[PDB]
Design a protein around this ligand. Sequence first.
Ligand SMILES: Oc1cc(F)ccc1CNc1ncccc1-c1cocn1
Lengths: 251, 245
Amino acid sequence: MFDPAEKYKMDHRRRGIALIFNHERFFWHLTLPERRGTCADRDNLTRRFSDLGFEVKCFNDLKAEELLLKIHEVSTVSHADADCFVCVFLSHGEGNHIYAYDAKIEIQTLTGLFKGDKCHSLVGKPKIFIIQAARGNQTNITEVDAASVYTLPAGADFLMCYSVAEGYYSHRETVNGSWYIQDLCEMLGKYGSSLEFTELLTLVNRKVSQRRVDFCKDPSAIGKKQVPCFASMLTKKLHFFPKSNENLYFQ
Amino acid sequence: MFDPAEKYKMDHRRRGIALIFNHERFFWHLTLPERRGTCADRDNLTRRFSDLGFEVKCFNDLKAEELLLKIHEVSTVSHADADCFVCVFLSHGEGNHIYAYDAKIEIQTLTGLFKGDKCHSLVGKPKIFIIQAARGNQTNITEVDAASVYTLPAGADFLMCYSVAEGYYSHRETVNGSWYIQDLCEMLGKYGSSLEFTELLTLVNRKVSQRRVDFCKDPSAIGKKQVPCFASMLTKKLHFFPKSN
Ligand SMILES: Oc1cc(F)ccc1CNc1ncccc1-c1cocn1
């Protein structure tokens, strides 16, 4: 019965939830810079994921306790009537940690909450994480952070998506937002509803790698390329085809 | 004129080289077990990559010096007339290291040799690494190792492919070979020449995740699932369509 073109089942009543944890400022005693532009990212993401049928829930500058609570909440709610789950971090990070407002959180513990064992409603459905996180270096300027967050995998049917890989650099325009998120969102706009999601993420890798970094306003920001990646542990093709909502309840 | 279905150019004279570093035994003072079965893997890989047009070059139980030499050799030869480059490690590993016969080698330094800067002939062409490596635990039995090798990325136009992810377990049958390699090679056989390579690797993730581990001859090998992954830094679709000659 084995099928090389098998797709994830994306015919549930609702598409599912897209969390967006958005971090602009941090507690003084962490000594991390403002991520001026992260709001463009949040809004651009919010729009593109909405037009794909996600209930988008944004959360600005949560402390560790608040963040762990809101994400544990979402893991224990039923996704039984949902196609998939998306979770997005716009912050600083280091190694296997993302930064909340007040301290770092182990990424494995956030993905761990949606592992088949602990969230039955999502077993066999895609769990996509998107992570725009790097090291805080210290009108519209382009700021550049060094890659810092390990490009971890997660578990069966997870897709981990990363702004930048080891040895490369992450770019954020202070008005237009992160290079990764701009190009992710451009591709979501044009191709989200037709293309297989990893096919799309590959276009994002081209779009971002192709961005030139030879003629730069800061002389020290020259020759710092951005190459994003993704770690697929998906088992099927993933498409976000428009859902039929013609005389149906999808709330 | 940006194109969402853009493919890597796979119309060069030759397909390219597939290295296979194959490690069965290790120096006494490392205390790592025989990988009985790794020869099935090597032969199965050799066949499937040959039928796709690769010049396959296997190397059995090289010491660190020998391995670094053979792979530096290959990085400095011209691949100008080649579609891509494949490199395969069948060994033990830990963190960001693969085991040669006599000591561990930093994976970044092996991938580093094919980074655009250092190997011009391969810039903009896919560089695929496939890594069947885990922690040596100590007729046809199924042996089970804990995942140990970090699922690293590499650079523009690299595809890093991994037998197993953090928290999961890697299986090798002592005659039939590694679960990952069996299912990789089955899929290469059936679909290698038609399917996009990441589409294929995804089938391998299904095939291997689906392998049941509830009714096992060893009671202690029960409930140890295998989930492989891949870290794509590819920028285009990758197909191994039959070359005309
Ligand atoms: O993927 C894994 C597999 C395992 F078996 C064990 C652990 C990991 C996660 N580690 C990483 N993953 C990707 C890039 C870097 C790391 C890294 C570097 O240092 C510490 N971690």
